[PDB]
Amino acid sequence: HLLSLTRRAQKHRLRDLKNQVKTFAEKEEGGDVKSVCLTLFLLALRAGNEHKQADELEAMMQGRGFGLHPAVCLAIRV
DNA sequence: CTGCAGGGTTTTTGTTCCAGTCTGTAGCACTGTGTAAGACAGGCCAGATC
Report DSSP letters for chain A, one per residue.
-TTTS-HHHHHHHHHHHHHHHHHHHHHHSTT-HHHHHHHHHHHHHHHTT-HHHHHHHHHHSSSS-SSS-HHHHHHHH-
Residue A19 CA distance to nucleotide B36 C1' (Å) = 73
Q: Which nucleotides of B are covered by protein (CB under 7 A)?
A: 11-15
Give the technique used to solve this structure: cryo-EM
A12 CA: nearest nucleotide by C1': B11
The span from the CA of A20 to the CA of A29, in Å, is 13
**Quick check: A45 and A52 in contact, CB under 8 A?**
no
Residue A2 CA distance to nucleotide B50 C1' (Å) = 111
Residue A77 CA distance to nucleotide B30 C1' (Å) = 24
